[PDB]
């Protein structure tokens, strides 16, 4: 398309919502290609990640960890206005794995505190993709400080299974998984700092052990449980987008399955089916489609169970509806 | 199916056998859906996992690590009588990744020492699946103490490749891989404990390093070698089911390949072919089909060679038959 | 086929070239099956792997880490003359994952210093495959000392996509990734040793932590960056073969994608498409095909960003050509 042709395309301003919820959108494209506009303000802020009051100096796109899910359709253009407030202390940028050129846009979006930039790229490939900050020389530090999220580029005709039958979800949730490397003092106690820069040296030493101190969903232990549990009802079709910008993960819905799973996160690659536990490599996003069949509480976890239950990578789904005794039944309840 | 219809189905009691062997079964289902009955007693027992005499307080389904492979066909019902003897000290349960609802059955099978329970579920999806204990709040500890195994839900018409051609194995083995985290003393020597509870705190500390001290097949270093090496013959078709309930693995048959590999372990997902090394994420089971073409010894290993040869993840196959010089030949034996 | 037939096949000697480059070959086979002859001399030598003068006693096939890529076509025979000079101190051999029998040829090629051997095997399966030294009892030590490479067995009719359309590359690169485990003294300084054997004990201790001190491409930090960046032009089709003989990796082309990726490395397994980050398990090779669309510098990395930017797994591609503003454009450059 020419610059003129692009300039004539309809524009649509999208309002982002905080994970795990996703902004309003239509699975099947409404009309031809458009320039979908988004704006995100970068916020360097302290976040508490566990019940011991452990702090991380988060570098959050739109104020959240992970950054919000942006949804467009194949061949639409995504135009992001990215803002770095003067209240911040570091330079930041953004690299869209969904984009083509200049390090995913990282090379064209380096903004110091007080600056903003506007990047536009054509979403030529359908699927879920990670996006993350990548400042030359300080790439992993920003990413493991929570500066990453994902976007979903839906096929214009919506989702389909391997044989072309449409797959239409009732609900969609975005789970961003984050590995954190929090420094500890001589007494095994997590350290606190009053400036992001202050923790850099100590954090790099922990990062080099390749052993995170915490692995969490939506920025903190228990973030997606209890009251923030995701919800659904028997019969509902749910798409769960999951990303990990720096380290491998292996999602599993305890009590359910991934009926269709685009493990590589790319829609032109046929989905795997009937999955118990799928795999998403560090630096990628994946997506699982499941139709709930039983009511109750489900644990959605990274299935290295130490990472899920000792380090924090566990979320819950609360499902309403009628119990199905054909699928499962307690013939004899626990007894002497 | 209604309660009445399920009650009318035929029932077959199966006698389990210890890994790596698999109880008798038919690849192609004989007759219509059945309620297949299994019984397993849980044994908390001390086991030795290496030649030095290192001990682990195992939590073992049917007394073995891994628990035995249960085999059924799609749409059969699996009815498990699970017994927790009064001689044990902890509450246990079971989560079948093959099942739908109540955390894989975990929420309906919590039994204290002195109790039993009977759970029935419909095996609606074909493939190999992990099953493991999962007591709320103590999940990884039970699993990495060896309380896990797998089941195989065969398609009613047996296995087929991705294009529909039947794949019939001559024999099958089940290799359960287990990551152990054994505490060490100040001399770097593994510690022993009177009771399993005494080891909890020290073990959790090791677990948090995400670095196992041992990674073994069938419960111990070298368990599948020597007189217990697996066997085959040139021309023989072997299915190798492999599971890891907590940590990733990358099986490799040194000197051979994975002709057909359902790396995700799900039979409705076409198998990869001509594999050198496949990948099974923690929390899943996979299966590889191979027709041996050369006689001799083969090493079957987790291909992180440090894990295979330093930590214990290596098994052997002894293969009988005639050498094929077309496939391979020593043109010049080692010489000056 | 018949004994006479194999004897009558043409023999062709090929001259190897050092990675990341690849010796001359044709994508579509030229003529019928041939016995392709290669010769490699093993070199035990000290190499420097980082900017701090860190040393490793490398065990290098053909004097390079990784060993060179050998290219043949399906059903050709690969006949390797492997030489171990009297100047070396250890016994070595070679295991081709592409081969069938005798531990990939390892059982037939054990050569002490001062000896040579000639192995021939039929390349019956198409794909890229790892080859590595594997002396019984010291397999990981040789492999993590850099004694590994890969071969590519192209289909006789060249590469094709999942729909049968031909995929012809303009150039090919071979990126071998190596995890090193270098001992450090109590001050944190990397240790140096007089002979390879002297470092054995200290090295195995580091290996058991499953945490490499360095993860590099082409044998050293920055080996494929700056003046040694790989190159391409907009519109050019490039195949990137990647291997890791001992540990998992997750390649990503920053600013690009893997248009077609044989993640398992086997050509009879349809390639995944539009990949952002792919996954190659330890003990395997994979291949990605990409058509460059934008000029500039690209970072090709292992996407656990700590491994890429702190440990060394980052390479660069320098691409020439015209910028495509349709694909990506800076609507507003960084500004207050
Ligand atoms: O799904 N937790 O084992
Ligand atoms: O390639 N090691 O079994
Ligand atoms: O290519 N690093 O995001
Ligand atoms: Cu940043
Ligand atoms: Cu990236
Ligand atoms: Cu238990
Ligand atoms: Cu589980
Ligand atoms: Cu060697
Ligand atoms: Cu190998």
GROMACS .gro file of C-alpha atoms in nm, chain B residues 184 190 210-213 247-248 250 252 254-257 259 271-279 290 293-295 297-299 303-307 309-311 323-336, chain C residues 1 6 77 79 95 97 99-105 108 110-111 114-122 124-126 128-130 132 134 140 143 181 204 207-210 245-246 248 264 266 268-269 279 282-285:
model
  106
  520UNK     CA    1   2.317  -3.232   5.141
  526UNK     CA    2   2.336  -3.652   5.090
  546UNK     CA    3   1.510  -2.557   4.053
  547UNK     CA    4   1.817  -2.779   4.026
  548UNK     CA    5   1.759  -3.148   4.090
  549UNK     CA    6   2.032  -3.351   4.253
  583UNK     CA    7   1.005  -3.088   3.481
  584UNK     CA    8   1.090  -3.077   3.111
  586UNK     CA    9   1.414  -3.424   2.586
  588UNK     CA   10   1.671  -3.938   2.262
  590UNK     CA   11   2.118  -4.294   2.076
  591UNK     CA   12   2.179  -4.495   1.758
  592UNK     CA   13   1.813  -4.475   1.661
  593UNK     CA   14   1.533  -4.220   1.615
  595UNK     CA   15   1.009  -4.263   1.370
  607UNK     CA   16   0.298  -3.714   1.527
  608UNK     CA   17   0.630  -3.555   1.429
  609UNK     CA   18   0.849  -3.793   1.227
  610UNK     CA   19   1.215  -3.896   1.193
  611UNK     CA   20   1.293  -3.730   1.526
  612UNK     CA   21   1.645  -3.721   1.671
  613UNK     CA   22   1.550  -3.572   2.009
  614UNK     CA   23   1.195  -3.484   2.110
  615UNK     CA   24   1.064  -3.262   2.388
  626UNK     CA   25   1.040  -4.683   1.651
  629UNK     CA   26   1.707  -5.159   1.237
  630UNK     CA   27   2.041  -5.233   1.402
  631UNK     CA   28   2.142  -5.476   1.678
  633UNK     CA   29   2.327  -5.154   2.279
  634UNK     CA   30   2.138  -4.822   2.264
  635UNK     CA   31   2.133  -4.548   2.525
  639UNK     CA   32   1.951  -3.528   2.600
  640UNK     CA   33   2.074  -3.265   2.838
  641UNK     CA   34   2.378  -3.496   2.865
  642UNK     CA   35   2.470  -3.363   3.208
  643UNK     CA   36   2.125  -3.473   3.330
  645UNK     CA   37   2.517  -3.897   3.253
  646UNK     CA   38   2.588  -3.699   3.567
  647UNK     CA   39   2.236  -3.692   3.723
  659UNK     CA   40   2.412  -5.591   1.162
  660UNK     CA   41   2.321  -5.386   0.854
  661UNK     CA   42   2.634  -5.261   0.672
  662UNK     CA   43   2.428  -5.068   0.419
  663UNK     CA   44   2.297  -4.849   0.704
  664UNK     CA   45   2.637  -4.822   0.869
  665UNK     CA   46   2.982  -4.972   0.840
  666UNK     CA   47   3.331  -4.916   0.978
  667UNK     CA   48   3.531  -4.872   0.656
  668UNK     CA   49   3.852  -4.842   0.859
  669UNK     CA   50   3.859  -4.948   1.223
  670UNK     CA   51   4.053  -4.722   1.464
  671UNK     CA   52   4.418  -4.754   1.366
  672UNK     CA   53   4.743  -4.558   1.356
  673UNK     CA   54   2.043  -5.229  -0.258
  678UNK     CA   55   2.688  -4.960  -0.323
  749UNK     CA   56   2.614  -4.212   0.225
  751UNK     CA   57   3.186  -4.132   0.474
  767UNK     CA   58   2.797  -3.990   1.716
  769UNK     CA   59   2.219  -3.834   1.523
  771UNK     CA   60   2.284  -4.220   1.145
  772UNK     CA   61   2.138  -4.557   1.241
  773UNK     CA   62   2.335  -4.800   1.454
  774UNK     CA   63   2.623  -4.826   1.704
  775UNK     CA   64   2.536  -4.520   1.912
  776UNK     CA   65   2.530  -4.311   1.592
  777UNK     CA   66   2.874  -4.441   1.498
  780UNK     CA   67   3.285  -4.772   1.592
  782UNK     CA   68   3.678  -4.454   1.929
  783UNK     CA   69   4.021  -4.324   1.835
  786UNK     CA   70   4.770  -4.115   1.688
  787UNK     CA   71   4.476  -4.303   1.536
  788UNK     CA   72   4.219  -4.242   1.260
  789UNK     CA   73   3.903  -4.419   1.152
  790UNK     CA   74   3.663  -4.413   0.860
  791UNK     CA   75   3.288  -4.444   0.919
  792UNK     CA   76   3.021  -4.464   0.650
  793UNK     CA   77   2.647  -4.443   0.709
  794UNK     CA   78   2.342  -4.406   0.483
  796UNK     CA   79   1.812  -4.227   0.535
  797UNK     CA   80   1.625  -3.942   0.708
  798UNK     CA   81   1.604  -3.580   0.584
  800UNK     CA   82   1.936  -3.114   1.016
  801UNK     CA   83   2.091  -3.332   1.290
  802UNK     CA   84   2.342  -3.286   1.568
  804UNK     CA   85   2.890  -3.489   1.881
  806UNK     CA   86   3.061  -3.928   2.301
  812UNK     CA   87   2.897  -3.448   2.855
  815UNK     CA   88   3.023  -3.213   2.432
  853UNK     CA   89   3.084  -2.431   3.229
  876UNK     CA   90   3.193  -3.132   3.639
  879UNK     CA   91   2.813  -2.876   3.507
  880UNK     CA   92   2.606  -3.025   3.792
  881UNK     CA   93   2.461  -2.682   3.873
  882UNK     CA   94   2.300  -2.702   3.526
  917UNK     CA   95   2.395  -3.054   2.149
  918UNK     CA   96   2.336  -3.034   2.523
  920UNK     CA   97   1.759  -2.608   2.513
  936UNK     CA   98   1.233  -3.033   1.525
  938UNK     CA   99   1.319  -3.285   1.039
  940UNK     CA  100   0.930  -3.471   0.671
  941UNK     CA  101   0.761  -3.290   0.963
  951UNK     CA  102   1.237  -2.388   2.030
  954UNK     CA  103   1.915  -2.983   2.377
  955UNK     CA  104   2.043  -3.266   2.160
  956UNK     CA  105   1.891  -3.135   1.836
  957UNK     CA  106   1.923  -2.900   1.541
   0.00000   0.00000   0.00000
